[PDB]
Amino acid sequence: QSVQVFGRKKTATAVAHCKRGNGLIKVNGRPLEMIEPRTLQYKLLEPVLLLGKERFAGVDIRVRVKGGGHVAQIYAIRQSISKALVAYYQKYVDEASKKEIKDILIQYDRTLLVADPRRCESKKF
């Protein structure tokens, strides 16, 4: 049993797969702490630090990203990690846990669950 979600930015699309495990997070086969722009390391670690290391201990997430850029991928990774957990706690944990996760995760930053509807504007003759 597992849950398959997505999160997006301008063009950087992510897909996340979460199932039972011991608490490892991988992106494109690499750990969460080896993703290349180390200045924005906290944006990758925000859903882990807001919720706690204990809350992620029952789930293993593997994330794949394609497209966009260096910071557009980080904003899509952090979205689909948090969105994978709120979907996993809904279907296989009681809704009281899912409501309190979705509560504190929106009051921090609204882009962890609801995507940013901003895309490049076209040009016409």
Partner: peptide
Amino acid sequence: AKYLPHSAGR
């Protein structure tokens, strides 16, 4: 209070 001064907020 946020972790980083990068947020890309509107």
